[PDB]
Short mmCIF file of C-alpha atoms and ligand atoms in Angstrom, two decimals:
data_model
loop_
_atom_site.label_atom_id
_atom_site.label_comp_id
_atom_site.label_asym_id
_atom_site.label_seq_id
_atom_site.Cartn_x
_atom_site.Cartn_y
_atom_site.Cartn_z
CA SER L 1 -3.00 23.87 10.06
CA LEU L 2 -3.44 21.62 13.11
CA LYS L 3 -4.39 18.61 10.91
CA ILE L 4 -2.70 15.24 11.16
CA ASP L 5 -1.40 15.57 7.58
CA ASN L 6 -0.46 19.31 8.09
CA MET L 7 0.21 20.42 11.59
CA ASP L 8 0.83 24.02 10.46
CA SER Q 1 -9.14 -17.83 -2.06
CA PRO Q 2 -6.04 -16.46 -0.42
CA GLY Q 3 -5.29 -14.68 -3.76
CA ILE Q 4 -8.81 -13.28 -4.67
CA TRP Q 5 -9.54 -9.54 -4.56
CA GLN Q 6 -12.53 -7.41 -5.63
CA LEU Q 7 -12.43 -3.85 -6.87
CA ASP Q 8 -15.02 -1.32 -5.68
CA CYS Q 9 -15.37 2.36 -6.64
CA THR Q 10 -17.38 4.83 -4.52
CA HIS Q 11 -17.83 8.58 -4.63
CA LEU Q 12 -17.30 11.36 -2.03
CA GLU Q 13 -16.62 15.12 -2.18
CA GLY Q 14 -16.76 15.04 -5.91
CA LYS Q 15 -13.82 12.58 -6.02
CA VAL Q 16 -13.62 8.85 -6.47
CA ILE Q 17 -12.38 6.42 -3.78
CA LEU Q 18 -11.12 3.16 -5.40
CA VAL Q 19 -10.99 0.22 -3.03
CA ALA Q 20 -9.57 -3.26 -3.28
CA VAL Q 21 -11.15 -5.84 -0.93
CA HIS Q 22 -9.45 -9.13 -0.11
CA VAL Q 23 -12.66 -11.24 -0.27
CA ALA Q 24 -11.80 -13.93 2.30
CA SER Q 25 -10.73 -11.50 5.06
CA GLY Q 26 -12.50 -8.21 4.34
CA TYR Q 27 -9.08 -6.39 4.47
CA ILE Q 28 -9.01 -3.33 2.18
CA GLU Q 29 -6.55 -0.94 0.49
CA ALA Q 30 -7.91 2.33 -1.05
CA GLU Q 31 -6.89 5.50 -2.80
CA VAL Q 32 -8.50 8.79 -3.84
CA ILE Q 33 -8.40 9.76 -7.54
CA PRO Q 34 -10.18 12.56 -9.41
CA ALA Q 35 -12.06 10.06 -11.51
CA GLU Q 36 -11.98 6.37 -12.35
CA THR Q 37 -9.98 5.69 -15.51
CA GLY Q 38 -8.31 2.50 -16.84
CA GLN Q 39 -4.90 4.14 -16.30
CA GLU Q 40 -5.60 4.94 -12.60
CA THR Q 41 -7.10 1.47 -12.01
CA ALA Q 42 -4.13 -0.17 -13.64
CA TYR Q 43 -1.61 1.72 -11.43
CA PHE Q 44 -3.65 0.86 -8.34
CA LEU Q 45 -3.53 -2.87 -9.18
CA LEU Q 46 0.18 -2.74 -9.82
CA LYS Q 47 0.62 -1.23 -6.29
CA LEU Q 48 -1.62 -3.87 -4.77
CA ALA Q 49 0.14 -6.81 -6.43
CA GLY Q 50 3.60 -5.66 -5.29
CA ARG Q 51 2.27 -5.71 -1.67
CA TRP Q 52 0.06 -8.87 -1.49
CA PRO Q 53 0.01 -12.09 -3.61
CA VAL Q 54 -2.81 -11.13 -5.92
CA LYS Q 55 -3.96 -14.12 -8.08
CA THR Q 56 -7.34 -12.87 -9.27
CA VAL Q 57 -9.07 -9.55 -9.37
CA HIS Q 58 -12.82 -9.22 -9.90
CA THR Q 59 -13.05 -5.85 -11.66
CA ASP Q 60 -15.66 -3.35 -10.55
CA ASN Q 61 -17.32 -2.58 -13.94
CA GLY Q 62 -17.11 -3.44 -17.59
CA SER Q 63 -15.01 -0.40 -18.52
CA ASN Q 64 -12.17 -1.57 -16.25
CA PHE Q 65 -12.70 -5.15 -17.45
CA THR Q 66 -12.34 -4.08 -21.08
CA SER Q 67 -9.50 -1.42 -20.55
CA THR Q 68 -6.30 -2.35 -22.43
CA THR Q 69 -4.28 -0.53 -19.78
CA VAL Q 70 -5.89 -2.54 -16.97
CA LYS Q 71 -5.30 -5.78 -18.96
CA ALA Q 72 -1.62 -4.70 -19.44
CA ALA Q 73 -1.08 -4.14 -15.72
CA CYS Q 74 -2.80 -7.44 -14.87
CA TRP Q 75 -0.57 -9.18 -17.43
CA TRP Q 76 2.57 -7.46 -16.04
CA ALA Q 77 1.73 -8.37 -12.43
CA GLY Q 78 0.54 -11.97 -13.09
CA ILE Q 79 -3.09 -11.29 -12.24
CA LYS Q 80 -6.06 -13.05 -13.75
CA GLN Q 81 -8.51 -10.33 -14.56
CA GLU Q 82 -12.12 -11.44 -14.05
CA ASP Q 83 -15.59 -9.81 -14.07
CA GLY Q 84 -17.20 -8.79 -10.77
CA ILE Q 85 -20.70 -10.02 -11.49
CA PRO Q 86 -22.35 -10.81 -8.13
CA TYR Q 87 -23.10 -14.48 -8.90
CA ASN Q 88 -23.76 -14.69 -5.21
CA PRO Q 89 -26.43 -11.97 -4.72
CA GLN Q 90 -25.28 -11.31 -1.08
CA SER Q 91 -22.09 -9.67 -2.67
CA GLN Q 92 -23.86 -6.45 -3.84
CA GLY Q 93 -25.08 -6.04 -0.24
CA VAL Q 94 -21.71 -6.67 1.44
CA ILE Q 95 -19.94 -4.12 -0.87
CA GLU Q 96 -22.69 -1.56 -0.32
CA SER Q 97 -22.62 -1.90 3.42
CA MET Q 98 -18.80 -1.58 3.27
CA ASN Q 99 -19.01 1.65 1.30
CA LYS Q 100 -21.56 3.04 3.77
CA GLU Q 101 -19.35 2.10 6.75
CA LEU Q 102 -16.27 3.60 5.12
CA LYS Q 103 -18.04 6.82 4.40
CA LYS Q 104 -19.32 6.95 7.97
CA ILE Q 105 -15.77 6.60 9.29
CA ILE Q 106 -14.50 9.18 6.81
CA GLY Q 107 -17.04 11.68 8.22
CA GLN Q 108 -15.99 10.83 11.78
CA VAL Q 109 -12.33 11.69 10.99
CA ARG Q 110 -12.72 14.23 8.25
CA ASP Q 111 -12.02 17.30 10.42
CA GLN Q 112 -8.72 15.76 11.62
CA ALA Q 113 -7.36 15.84 8.01
CA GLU Q 114 -6.69 18.64 5.58
CA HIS Q 115 -7.05 16.35 2.53
CA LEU Q 116 -9.71 13.75 1.80
CA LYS Q 117 -6.99 11.24 0.90
CA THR Q 118 -5.74 11.38 4.55
CA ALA Q 119 -9.22 10.78 5.91
CA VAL Q 120 -9.61 7.80 3.56
CA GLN Q 121 -6.34 6.30 4.80
CA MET Q 122 -7.51 6.85 8.42
CA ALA Q 123 -10.73 4.92 7.47
CA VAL Q 124 -8.67 2.15 5.90
CA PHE Q 125 -6.62 1.96 9.07
CA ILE Q 126 -9.74 1.82 11.33
CA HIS Q 127 -11.45 -0.78 9.08
CA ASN Q 128 -8.46 -3.11 8.96
CA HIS Q 129 -7.70 -2.94 12.70
CA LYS Q 130 -11.30 -3.39 13.96
CA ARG Q 131 -11.85 -6.63 15.87
CA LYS Q 132 -15.03 -8.72 15.64
CA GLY Q 133 -12.14 -12.07 17.64
CA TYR Q 134 -9.65 -11.23 14.87
CA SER Q 135 -9.35 -8.05 12.70
CA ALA Q 136 -9.28 -8.14 8.91
CA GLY Q 137 -5.52 -7.35 9.03
CA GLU Q 138 -5.04 -10.45 11.18
CA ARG Q 139 -7.27 -12.62 9.04
CA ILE Q 140 -5.50 -11.77 5.78
CA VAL Q 141 -2.01 -12.53 7.26
CA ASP Q 142 -3.33 -15.83 8.74
CA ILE Q 143 -4.93 -16.84 5.47
CA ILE Q 144 -1.85 -16.12 3.36
CA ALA Q 145 0.60 -17.65 5.84
CA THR Q 146 -1.52 -20.81 5.92
CA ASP Q 147 -1.42 -20.91 2.10
CA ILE Q 148 2.39 -20.44 2.03
CA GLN Q 149 2.82 -23.47 4.41
CA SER P 1 10.72 -7.69 15.59
CA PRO P 2 7.49 -8.19 13.61
CA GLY P 3 6.47 -4.51 13.95
CA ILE P 4 9.77 -2.66 13.15
CA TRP P 5 10.16 -0.62 9.96
CA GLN P 6 12.88 1.72 8.68
CA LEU P 7 12.37 4.71 6.42
CA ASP P 8 14.78 5.35 3.54
CA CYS P 9 14.78 8.23 1.04
CA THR P 10 16.66 8.05 -2.32
CA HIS P 11 16.68 10.23 -5.40
CA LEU P 12 16.11 9.52 -9.09
CA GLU P 13 15.11 11.63 -12.07
CA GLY P 14 15.00 14.80 -9.97
CA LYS P 15 12.30 13.26 -7.72
CA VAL P 16 12.48 11.47 -4.40
CA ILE P 17 11.60 7.82 -3.76
CA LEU P 18 10.52 7.27 -0.12
CA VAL P 19 10.79 3.61 0.98
CA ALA P 20 9.67 1.77 4.11
CA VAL P 21 11.56 -1.46 4.80
CA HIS P 22 10.27 -4.09 7.19
CA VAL P 23 13.62 -4.81 8.82
CA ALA P 24 13.17 -8.52 9.72
CA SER P 25 11.97 -9.57 6.20
CA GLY P 26 13.40 -6.98 3.77
CA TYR P 27 9.82 -6.41 2.40
CA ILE P 28 9.40 -2.85 1.11
CA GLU P 29 6.66 -0.33 0.17
CA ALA P 30 7.63 2.88 -1.74
CA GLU P 31 6.26 6.01 -3.33
CA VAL P 32 7.52 8.85 -5.52
CA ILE P 33 7.12 12.43 -4.29
CA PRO P 34 8.56 15.70 -5.65
CA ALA P 35 10.58 16.25 -2.48
CA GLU P 36 10.76 14.81 1.05
CA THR P 37 8.72 16.90 3.44
CA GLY P 38 7.25 16.06 6.92
CA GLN P 39 3.72 16.30 5.41
CA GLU P 40 4.53 13.69 2.69
CA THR P 41 6.37 11.43 5.13
CA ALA P 42 3.47 11.58 7.55
CA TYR P 43 0.90 10.57 4.87
CA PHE P 44 3.16 7.72 3.76
CA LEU P 45 3.34 6.36 7.35
CA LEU P 46 -0.41 6.59 7.74
CA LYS P 47 -0.79 4.49 4.54
CA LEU P 48 1.77 1.96 5.75
CA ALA P 49 0.20 1.54 9.23
CA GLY P 50 -3.29 0.92 7.82
CA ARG P 51 -1.77 -1.96 5.77
CA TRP P 52 0.67 -3.66 8.18
CA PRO P 53 0.93 -3.69 12.02
CA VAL P 54 3.56 -1.01 12.40
CA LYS P 55 4.82 -0.72 16.01
CA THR P 56 8.02 1.19 15.50
CA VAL P 57 9.42 3.36 12.74
CA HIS P 58 13.15 4.24 12.51
CA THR P 59 12.98 7.60 10.73
CA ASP P 60 15.42 8.32 7.93
CA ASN P 61 16.79 11.70 9.08
CA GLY P 62 16.54 14.27 11.85
CA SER P 63 14.11 16.50 9.94
CA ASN P 64 11.44 13.74 9.78
CA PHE P 65 12.28 12.79 13.38
CA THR P 66 11.61 16.36 14.54
CA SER P 67 8.62 17.12 12.20
CA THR P 68 5.45 17.87 14.15
CA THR P 69 3.37 16.48 11.27
CA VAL P 70 5.28 13.19 11.29
CA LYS P 71 4.88 12.98 15.12
CA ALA P 72 1.11 13.69 14.71
CA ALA P 73 0.73 10.89 12.15
CA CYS P 74 2.77 8.46 14.32
CA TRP P 75 0.57 9.43 17.30
CA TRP P 76 -2.61 8.96 15.28
CA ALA P 77 -1.55 5.54 13.98
CA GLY P 78 -0.09 4.21 17.26
CA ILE P 79 3.53 4.20 16.05
CA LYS P 80 6.60 4.67 18.18
CA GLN P 81 8.72 7.14 16.28
CA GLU P 82 12.42 6.42 16.75
CA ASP P 83 15.73 7.64 15.27
CA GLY P 84 17.42 5.68 12.47
CA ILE P 85 20.97 5.86 13.72
CA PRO P 86 22.85 2.78 12.47
CA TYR P 87 23.98 1.51 15.89
CA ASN P 88 24.67 -1.60 13.93
CA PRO P 89 27.12 -0.29 11.29
CA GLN P 90 26.11 -3.07 8.77
CA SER P 91 22.75 -1.09 8.42
CA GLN P 92 24.14 1.85 6.32
CA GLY P 93 25.46 -0.84 3.91
CA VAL P 94 22.26 -2.86 3.70
CA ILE P 95 20.18 0.27 2.92
CA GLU P 96 22.70 1.55 0.40
CA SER P 97 22.85 -1.78 -1.44
CA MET P 98 19.03 -1.89 -1.47
CA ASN P 99 18.85 1.58 -3.00
CA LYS P 100 21.36 0.53 -5.63
CA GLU P 101 19.41 -2.69 -6.46
CA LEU P 102 16.11 -0.74 -6.63
CA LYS P 103 17.60 1.79 -8.97
CA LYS P 104 19.01 -1.01 -11.16
CA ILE P 105 15.56 -2.59 -11.38
CA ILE P 106 13.92 0.73 -12.11
CA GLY P 107 16.31 1.22 -15.01
CA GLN P 108 15.52 -2.33 -16.30
CA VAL P 109 11.77 -1.50 -16.41
CA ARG P 110 11.79 2.15 -16.96
CA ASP P 111 10.91 2.00 -20.69
CA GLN P 112 7.79 -0.11 -19.93
CA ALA P 113 6.28 2.79 -17.91
CA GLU P 114 5.24 6.29 -18.85
CA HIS P 115 5.70 7.57 -15.30
CA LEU P 116 8.54 7.00 -12.85
CA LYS P 117 6.01 6.09 -10.20
CA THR P 118 4.93 3.08 -12.26
CA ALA P 119 8.54 1.93 -12.66
CA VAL P 120 9.03 2.25 -8.87
CA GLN P 121 6.01 0.07 -8.19
CA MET P 122 7.26 -2.50 -10.70
CA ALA P 123 10.58 -2.46 -8.78
CA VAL P 124 8.73 -2.90 -5.49
CA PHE P 125 6.89 -5.87 -7.01
CA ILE P 126 10.10 -7.52 -8.27
CA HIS P 127 11.95 -6.90 -4.99
CA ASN P 128 9.18 -8.37 -2.83
CA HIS P 129 8.58 -11.44 -4.99
CA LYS P 130 12.28 -12.38 -5.51
CA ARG P 131 13.22 -15.69 -3.82
CA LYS P 132 16.55 -16.38 -2.06
CA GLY P 133 14.03 -20.27 -0.32
CA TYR P 134 11.44 -17.61 0.53
CA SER P 135 10.69 -14.11 -0.85
CA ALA P 136 10.44 -11.00 1.33
CA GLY P 137 6.64 -11.04 0.78
CA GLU P 138 6.55 -14.57 2.18
CA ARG P 139 8.85 -13.78 5.06
CA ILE P 140 6.85 -10.75 6.29
CA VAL P 141 3.52 -12.72 6.29
CA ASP P 142 5.24 -15.68 8.10
CA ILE P 143 6.71 -13.38 10.67
CA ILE P 144 3.50 -11.51 11.36
CA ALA P 145 1.33 -14.66 11.43
CA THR P 146 3.75 -16.29 13.86
CA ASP P 147 3.44 -13.22 16.09
CA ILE P 148 -0.40 -13.28 15.95
CA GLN P 149 -0.43 -16.98 17.10
CA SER B 1 1.32 5.15 -25.55
CA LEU B 2 2.12 1.41 -25.37
CA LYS B 3 3.23 1.66 -21.68
CA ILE B 4 1.84 -0.59 -18.96
CA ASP B 5 0.43 2.46 -17.24
CA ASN B 6 -0.88 4.00 -20.54
CA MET B 7 -1.51 1.65 -23.37
CA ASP B 8 -2.48 4.51 -25.75
CL1 CL I 201 -15.46 8.35 -12.32
#
């Protein structure tokens, strides 16, 4: 999700 | 004073952020929980005391001071559980300004994290590394190492 | 030296215990998660680097070495992400004996805790306070303070 | 439940 804790 | 910590509980996004502040350095550790209970506070103190030499904790309110589960964890971990009455008035102010600063940093990073708990750990990281000159992470290591020696 | 950590993942009770070991001191931090994923490993490293000055992490397997989420957290926190290949063969053995000792301790406390995660933090506490004469908690503070000065 | 993490 393009977040540091969830790059999906 | 190397061993003295203060608990602090603040609210954001409908959740609770529980913070432990090492008083002498201003270093913090924090977690996000859905609400403050004795059981959550007790587990948080057990984590803290396995990581730093916690002698005394000033609890953040009378419910956590009274909680049998908090008193059990403090017994287990060798912590003296104390009240957190601001005998020095300047305390209320320092805790409040800390919560305001942490929430400011949370908002600055919030869009980089899916979960609030990630943004809170990014705020912990920025708080503990900030210099103003030693950071709080440096000060707490220096204070404890000086005690050990 | 002062900034090098190694990840380690062991299983108990159908859950996973993820451990970070500060290599020079043997000090550890740990958590329980339902299974090892890049997202959980990344959050764990972000917690660790807000608490101690983490320069380098030797990852515990190729999946966490490759994970884009772990590389994003190591980028965010300023960590050099490295492999965990035991170039020094005595490493496999040290990790394995640590996992065995941690599981022994967990079993010794397990009936004092409702949740496994509590038992794991009690084991972390006992491991880091044990002397044999300094404890790992003393050694990591000594090492870091020496590096700061 | 007379556990350190849950004294009920
Ligand atoms: Cl609450």
